[PDB]
Amino acid sequence: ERILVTGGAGFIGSHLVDALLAKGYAVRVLDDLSTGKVGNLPMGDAGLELLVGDAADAALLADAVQGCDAVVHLAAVASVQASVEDPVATHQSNFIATLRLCEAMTAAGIRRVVFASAAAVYGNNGEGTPIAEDTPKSPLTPFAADKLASEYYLDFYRRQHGLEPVILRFFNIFGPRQDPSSPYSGVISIFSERAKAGRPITLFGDGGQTRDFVYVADLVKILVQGLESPAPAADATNVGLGGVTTLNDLIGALQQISGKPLQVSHGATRSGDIRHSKADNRRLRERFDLGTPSSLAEGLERLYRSL
C-alpha cells in the first residue's frame, strides 16, 4: 500500500513520512521544497519516493496520484503572513492544489484524503471559549479563507463524487524540524531556539496569552488513524488537546529545561492577536484514539534535546 503525502518534506509531513514507512507503507512525497527540506526525509529508504514540483500542477498530480491507495494533503504555504503579502500566488498553493487534488483523486478512483485545515478558519470567534467545530467561521486572511474553501470543495467532492475526506483543523503544532527562522514562526520553535543558543527572547504582550499546543508526534498518530479508519465522519474535527498554556508558563518550562535563565525583552501585543485560544476536542476524543498525549513539558524536552 502506497500513501501520497503532499507537503511530505515539511515539518509535519516528514514526521508523518517516518511513521508511515515504519508501519510498512510505501510513501510518495510531493513537495516543491519551498519550505520543505530533503534533509527532513529518510532519503535512501527503499520505500520512499520523492517527487519535486507544484501540488497545484494538474499533470504532475495525475502522475503523483497513480498507484496510490490514499492521500494526506499537507502542502500549502504555511505562513499566514505570506498570504497577506501575496494573495494571488498563495491562493494557488493554499486552495488550487486542493481543487486539483480532488480532480486527480476522482479520475483515478482514490477516495481517502486526510486534509490539514487550520484553527485560523474561526478568526477571532471563540476567543476565550472552548472552540467547537460549529463555532462561526471568520477567516481573516487569504490563507484562512483558502483553508475553509478547501473544506467546502472537499465536502462537495464527497457528496458529488464519492470522495472520503478527513478534515482536521490543526491548533498550535510544535516539535522537531519546525523552522524557527521567520519572525512569524511558531512561538515554541522561536523560544526554544533562543533558549538553546542562550539568546534573549521577545515576549509580545504580558505573556498571559494561552494556546492549545499539540506535539507533532501526537498529531502524526491522528493523521495515520485518519488514513486507516473504516468510515470517517464527513465534517471537520479540531485537533487540539483542550490544553491551556500561558506564554509565561512556556517560558518557565523552557527555563527549567535549559537549566539557564531566559532573558525576556518586552514587546507590544501583536495587532490582532488572540489572547485565549483553546479547542473543544470532544469530536477528536470520540472519533480518534488519543491514548495519553505528550504533556507540554515532555514535548518541549523532546524538541530541546533535538536542537
Ligand X SMILES: NC(=O)c1ccc[n+]([C@@H]2O[C@H](COP(=O)([O-])OP(=O)(O)OC[C@H]3O[C@@H](n4cnc5c(N)ncnc54)[C@H](O)[C@@H]3O)[C@@H](O)[C@H]2O)c1
Ligand Y SMILES: CC(=O)N[C@H]1[C@@H](OP(=O)(O)OP(=O)(O)OC[C@H]2O[C@@H](n3ccc(=O)[nH]c3=O)[C@H](O)[C@@H]2O)O[C@H](CO)[C@@H](O)[C@@H]1O
Residues near ligand Y, by CB under 6 A: 79-81, 120, 144, 172, 184-187, 190, 202-204, 209, 211, 247, 270, 272-273, 277
How far apart CA 65 and CA 69 sit, in angstroms, is 8
Report the alpha-carbon angle 286-155-220, nearest 5.
45
How far apart CA 163 and CA 150 sit, in angstroms, is 13
137 binds, among ligand Y, ligand X, a second copy, none (CB under 5 to 8 A by kind): a second copy
Task: Work out which of 76, 113, 144, 250 binds ligand X, going by CB under 6 A.
Answer: 76
How far apart CA 145 and CA 279 sit, in angstroms, is 19
Task: Indicate the residue among 95 and 215 with the shorter CB distance to a second copy.
Answer: 95
Distance of CA 303 to the CA centre of its chain: 17
Stretch that binds ligand X, among 41-49, 81-89, 165-173, 290-298 (CB under 6 A): 165-173
Task: Indicate the residue among 162 and 227 with the shorter CB distance to ligand X.
Answer: 227
User: 243 to each of 62, 90, 97, 137, 277, how far by Cα in Å?
Assistant: 40, 31, 32, 22, 9
Task: Work out which of 4, 17, 36, 203 binds ligand X, going by CB under 6 A.
Answer: 36
> Within positions 118 to 137, which residues make up the interface with a second copy, using CB under 8 A?
134, 136-137
Minimum gap (Å) between residue 2 Cβ and ligand X: 18
Distance of CA 68 to the CA centre of its chain: 22
The breaks in the chain (C to N more than 2.5 Å) occur after none
The closest alpha carbon to 20, from 224, 217, 229, belongs to 224
Minimum gap (Å) between residue 246 Cβ and a second copy: 27
Minimum gap (Å) between residue 189 Cβ and ligand Y: 8
The pairing of beta strand 245-246 with beta strand 210-211 = antiparallel
* Helix, strand, coil share of the chain (percent; to 5): 40, 20, 40
Binding-residue pattern over the window 147 to 166 for a second copy, x denoting contact by CB under 8 A: -xx--xx-xx--xx------
How far apart CA 191 and CA 11 sit, in angstroms, is 17
106 binds, among ligand Y, a second copy, ligand X, none (CB under 5 to 8 A by kind): none
Binding-residue pattern over the window 70 to 109 for a second copy, x denoting contact by CB under 8 A: --------------x--xx--x---x---xx-xx------
Which residues lie near a second copy (CB under 8 A)? 84, 87-88, 91, 95, 99-100, 102-103, 134, 136-137, 139-142, 144-146, 148-149, 152-153, 155-156, 159-160
Which residues lie near ligand X (CB under 6 A)? 6-7, 9-13, 30-36, 54-56, 74-78, 93, 97, 116, 118, 170, 172-173, 186
